[PDB]
Structure 1
Amino acid sequence: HHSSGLVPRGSHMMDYIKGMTWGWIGNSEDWRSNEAERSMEEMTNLAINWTAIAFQGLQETAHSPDITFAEPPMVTDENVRWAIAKAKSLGLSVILKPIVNVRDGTWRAHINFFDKDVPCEPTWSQWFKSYESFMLHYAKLAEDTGCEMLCIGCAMVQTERREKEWRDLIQKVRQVYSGIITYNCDKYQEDEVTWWDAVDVMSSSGYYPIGSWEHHESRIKKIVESWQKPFFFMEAGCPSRLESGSVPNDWNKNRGQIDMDEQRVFYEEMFKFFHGQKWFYGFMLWDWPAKLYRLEDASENDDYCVYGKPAAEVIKSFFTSNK
């Protein structure tokens, strides 16, 4: 079958991940451009051996059951096959990461339905059927393209209690995708997912504030040892902005207030505490755009991207080191 501990069953293959996320938010026009090719090649200078190909699907509100995918302006199946094959042509292993977003701008962590089925209301059953169609479409693409890993969700906090529905979705994914399955829980939620045993690898969003990494290493170590599964960060990063290090997840904080040093300090601290531990399997960083800004414009860029910034040198020297 599939249940296992520290190492996924041989038929699904644990590598130490040196990764960068590519392509977010997933815009067909961006991925089809010439610039996308230059972007992905430049990303390889971080001395990564993995990339997460990340893109969005959409639902209207946090409480609507229908998810749309692979329609304008979202990525086409051809754009996705292109990105996977290009990555593999550059020597990278691939995590496919389909992520549902909400058109009204609500954070997907609030997607939620009543516990009680009510006749005139949307139900969990209707949303999970729609989510299953979305994730099974990309699980089949992941299989066809040889993606080493599939991430079956990202910080879906207010769905995680629906344990039978998550287990049922995973059983369907297993029937069409034979590689490694992970789920990406949100920051602070590593001990709150009751169904970690149903995936191959645990992962979370490492957006822990400056000054907290030593505490989180100790907290996470105990959680991972209690589950006896491999663990890595499926996202970790910080914008190059004033005070972003105190809330590295907050992509809306202090827009246009540039601070290259804040991003650098975040990375130095994260790598000081998370490195070679036998129970830890590395970093999928956040993030790198399909259309990359000019090196000359990097000192004025307020994004998560490390291209042209001091943090890039911290990452490169960590990923090419003997830790």
Structure 2
Amino acid sequence: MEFIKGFTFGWDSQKGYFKTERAKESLRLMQERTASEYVIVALAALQDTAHSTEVDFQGSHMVDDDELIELIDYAKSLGLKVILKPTVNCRNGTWRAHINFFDMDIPGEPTWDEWFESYINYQKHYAKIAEKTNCEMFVVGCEMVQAERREDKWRELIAEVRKDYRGLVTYNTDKYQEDNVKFWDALDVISSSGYYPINDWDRQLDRIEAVVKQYDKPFFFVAAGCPSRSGSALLPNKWDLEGAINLQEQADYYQVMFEKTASRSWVGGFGLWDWQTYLYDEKDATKNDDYGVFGKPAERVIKAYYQSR
């Protein structure tokens, strides 16, 4: 598989965002300033809590099918390939990694089968969209740490997705969880949220290597990145981390990350975390403490490295 030079887009979007021309502008800025050849459209449905069974993708937190199809078409019209990544959030704030139900089915309690039924139906709806728009890859799940043990249900879900979509299929595991998934044989690509510390890449890359070699498959970090924020380089996943603005720390993180993964041939690309739909003004970049890379010194590290591959 070719080296995926990718960037995540659209995580901030809601109903209506993908029609506006600000969205089309942001996408062109993203491609121009980073040299990304892939866009990872990251969307999120909602369930009430980590222990609810209804997954809701029709409410206004979610873009409508028509503006999504349009945004994808527009992306491909710019020479960008498209990975579609529908995951799920909780309305009470709980990280999806905690979505969980009892092992046994208990009378009157929510069950794994009820959740997976709602979640399968959600995935199939977007797998049909991925097929009609000829997306290159489709991500059936993201950081579902406590659900990953339910292997037969993930295998059932992947089969259901293949009925609608004939392209590449992967699953996005969380950091340090690459061997927590036992259904990699059923996917085409292995991927993880590579939020590893700036000073621990060697140990982590060596662990992941041995996990990948147990399987048939290419690997890439479908998510990776770092806020421009003091302390983030050691904990790049923690989006609510409290620390002063620090653009240089974000640039150091990307420099180190590309340097360490460039020597590893099984590391097959990136879906850098994120490029916002409603991008800030480049004048305010110097005071932005978010994952965004627009107008910041890390923007040039990514452009150069992606342009070197």
Q: 1:279 matched to which residue of 2?
A: 266
Aligned residues of 1:180 and 1:200 also touching (Cα < 8 A): yes
Q: Structure 1: where are the runs of 5+ without partners?
A: 1-13
For residues 17-74 of structure 1, the C-alpha deviation after alignment (integer angstroms, 9 at most, x for no partner) is 0000000033123322221011000000211110101111000000000000032132
How far does the alpha carbon of each residue in 1:215-249 deviate from its partner, in whole angstroms, 9 at most, with x for none? 21211111111223100001000000111111100
**Match in the other structure for 2:204:** 216
- Unmatched segments (≥5 aa) in structure 2: none
Determine whether 1:193 maps to 2:212. Answer: no
Q: Residues 258 and 305 of structure 2 are in contact (CA less than 8 Å); yes or no, is this contact kept in structure 1?
A: yes
Is the contact between residue 29 and residue 73 of structure 1 (CA under 8 Å) also seen in structure 2?
no
% identical equivalent positions: 51
* Counterpart AA for 1:266: Y
Between the aligned partners of 1:36 and 1:292, the Cα distance in structure 2 is 8
CA deviation vs aligned residue, 1:184-235 (integer Å, no higher than 9, x gap): 0000001111111010000000100110112212111111112231000010
Amino acid at match of 1:31: F
Q: Alignment partner of 1:171: what SS?
A: helix
For the residues of structure 2 that align with 1:201 and 1:180, how far apart are their CA atoms? Answer: 7
Is the Cα–Cα contact under 8 Å of residues 185 and 216 in structure 2 kept in the other structure? no
Q: 1:62 aligns with which of 43, 50, 54?
A: 50
The 3-state SS of whatever aligns with 1:101 is strand
Partner of 2:30: 43
Shift of 1:276: 5.5
SS at match of 1:223: helix
Question: SS state of the match for residue 53, structure 1?
Answer: strand
Shift in Å at residue 86 of structure 1?
1.3
Distance (whole Å) between structure 2 residues aligned to residue 82 and residue 304 of structure 1: 26
Tell me, in whole angstroms, the C-alpha distance in 2 between the residues paired with 1:276 and 1:134: 38
Q: Is the CA contact (8 Å cut-off) linking 1:25 and 1:56 kept in structure 2? A: no
Conserved? CA contact 2:12–2:278, under 8 Å: no
Structure 1 counterpart of 2:298: 311
2:287 aligned partner: 300
1:249-284 CA deviation, whole Å, 9 max, x = no partner? 0000126x2100111111011111112533221111
CA contact (8 A) 1:213 1:273 kept: yes
TM-score (norm 1): 0.93
Counterpart residue type for residue 7 of structure 2: M
1:313 maps to a residue whose letter is R
Give the SS at the match of 1:238: coil
Segments ≥4 residues shifted beyond 6 Å: none
Which letter does structure 2 place at the counterpart of 1:207? Y
Displacement of 1:79 after TM fit? 1.8
1:241 corresponds to which residue?
A: 229
Q: 2:16 aligns with which of 29, 50, 53?
A: 29
- TM-score, L = length of structure 2: 0.97
1:8 corresponds in structure 2 to none
1:84 matched to 2:72: yes
Aligned equivalent of 2:249: 262
Match runs of 1:54-203 below 5 Å: 54-203=42-191
Q: Deviations over 1:132-158 (max 9, x none)?
A: 010000000100111011000000011
Distance 2:113 2:165 in 1: 23
**1:166 & 1:74 partners in 2: Cα distance?**
23
SS for the counterpart of 1:32 is coil
| Counterpart secondary structure, 1:283 | strand
Q: How many equivalent residue pairs?
A: 308
Please give the secondary structure, in 2, of the residue aligned with 1:267: helix
SS at match of 2:16: helix
Q: What is the distance in 1 between the residues matched to 2:20 and 2:241?
A: 30
Q: What aligned pairs does 1:5-20 form with structure 2 within 5 A after superposition?
A: 14-20=1-7
Q: Which moved more, 1:25-34 or 1:231-240?
A: 25-34
One-letter identity of the residue aligned with 2:231: E
Which residue identity is paired with 2:13?
A: G
Amino acid at match of 1:198: A
Cα pair 1:26 1:54 within 8 Å, conserved: no
